């Protein structure tokens, strides 16, 4: 039983069409609760979740103000990174920033992180010790030295230690009805055949809130992974997630094949056997 | 923000924070918050009304920002018993003030012109949020 809060920031440069666009999102566990978009009717942090709307207008004014500060910072960041990398202004480059903090069942601090990337490759990350910046390229080294001289690591320590964790505990306590749920997967199984000499079996999990699920199809023996076509977790849009794990067996009409579903909602790893 | 007062709404927002904070707990917390606010406002006025700067002036701005950070941290110590996240926000504000001063030294004045506005913007937003939080704790009582 663990929870987390994360914030994602994507600033995409638009040469010629105007100023770069900005998308900011915030997650608790796997539920989004704040959004932003530079190309929006009202440039404010519009709420999504029902449990975040309980906050007063002062909180939303503060969040909008801080996100506008972040947007100006990211525009200047695109400019300065284009300056470092000596890249032509014709191209488009996408600055990406992550930061957040995780807590356990005790709701105490466990791990805070802050990552920053220029184009896919991670540019500057913050180590688990929350002291030194992991840098990759020469420009990353220059900005690492600038931030260490500017004493930025201590502020991020003070944030991800106390402020992020206390805000997360407030969010969980305020919205316990939505976040503290743990829905068991409504698993089932489906069958299909091709050419009457080979058949596909699919183990399905339909509705469950925690995104971490483990579907393992296997034979009478254990650990048969090579034959599994496993699809990454699919958000259904209602907050629940889905996943289907399938195998293509040659024998057909087999009771030797099993599906194991491991999830927080299930007290015991649920076993599904094919039903003729 | 390019004019003489880059952001004078920090003083008004901190005055609101003080008035909504005087109803609960001792008043020296409001004293520390308001003193830190006046130091931050003086530093922003001094850096904003720049001839475009003297290193000694840089040092003075650092002194005001660090003293405001000390006021914020003492307020965080004497407020964190009630509404712990408000105390955490105060600690973050103090560390932000210290890091802003450390930037002020190690930055060109033209580069710091925007960052002073950014720091004032963030601190004003945090002050408004803190005011709302202490206000709802007042309402719950």
């Amino acid at each position: 039983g663990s929870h987390s809060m994360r914030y994602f920031f994507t600033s995409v440069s638009r040469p010629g069409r105007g100023e770069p666009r900005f998308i900011a999102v915030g997650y608790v566990d796997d539920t989004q609760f704040v959004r932003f978009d530079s190309d929006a009717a009202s440039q404010r942090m519009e709420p999504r979740a029902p449990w975040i709307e309980q906050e007063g207008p002062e909180y939303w004014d503060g969040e909008t103000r801080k996100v506008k500060a972040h947007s100006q910072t990211h525009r200047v960041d695109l400019g300065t990174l284009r300056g470092y990398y000596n890249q032509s202004e014709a191209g488009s480059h996408t600055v990406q920033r992550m930061y957040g903090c995780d807590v356990g069942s005790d709701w105490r601090f466990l791990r805070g992180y802050h990552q920053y990337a220029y184009d896919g490759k991670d540019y500057i990350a913050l180590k688990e010790d929350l002291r030194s910046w992991t840098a990759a390229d020469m420009a990353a080294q220059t900005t690492k030295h600038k931030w260490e001289a500017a004493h930025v690591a201590e502020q991020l320590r003070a944030y991800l230690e106390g402020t992020c964790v206390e805000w997360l505990r407030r969010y969980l306590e305020n919205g316990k009805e939505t976040l503290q749920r743990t829905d068991a997967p409504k698993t089932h199984m489906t069958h299909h055949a091709v050419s009457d000499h080979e058949a596909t079996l699919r183990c399905w999990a339909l509705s469950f809130y925690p995104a971490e699920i483990t579907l393992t199809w296997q034979r009478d023996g254990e650990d048969q992974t090579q034959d599994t076509e496993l699809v990454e977790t699919r958000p259904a849009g209602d907050g629940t997630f889905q996943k289907w794990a399938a195998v293509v067996v040659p024998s057909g009409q087999e009771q030797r094949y099993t599906c194991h579903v491991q999830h927080e909602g299930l007290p015991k790893p649920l076993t599904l056997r094919w039903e003729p | 923000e390019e004019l003489r007062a880059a952001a004078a709404e920090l003083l008004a927002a901190a005055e609101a924070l003080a008035e909504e904070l005087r109803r609960l707990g001792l008043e020296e917390a409001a004293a520390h918050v308001l003193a830190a606010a006046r130091h931050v406002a003086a530093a922003l006025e001094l850096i904003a009304a720049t001839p475009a700067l003297n290193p000694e002036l840089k040092r003075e701005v650092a002194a005001h920002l660090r003293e405001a950070a000390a006021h914020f941290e003492a307020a965080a110590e004497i407020v964190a018993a009630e509404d712990p996240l408000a105390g955490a926000m105060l600690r973050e504000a103090a560390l932000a003030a210290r890091s802003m001063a450390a930037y002020v030294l190690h930055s060109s004045p033209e580069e710091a012109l925007q960052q002073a506005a950014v720091f004032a913007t963030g601190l004003a937003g945090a002050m408004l949020t803190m005011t709302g939080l202490v206000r709802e704790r007042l309402a719950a009582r």
Binding site: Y7, Y59, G62, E63, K66, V67, A69, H70, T73, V76, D77, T80, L81, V95, Y99, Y116, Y123, I124, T143, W147, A150, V152, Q155, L156, Y159, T163, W167 | M89, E92, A93, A96, S99, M100, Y103, Q114, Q115, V118, F119, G122, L123, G125, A126, T129
Partner: peptide, 9 residues
Amino acid sequence: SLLMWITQC
């Protein structure tokens, strides 16, 4: 909430 003051990379 968010990080209050964010530096310029």
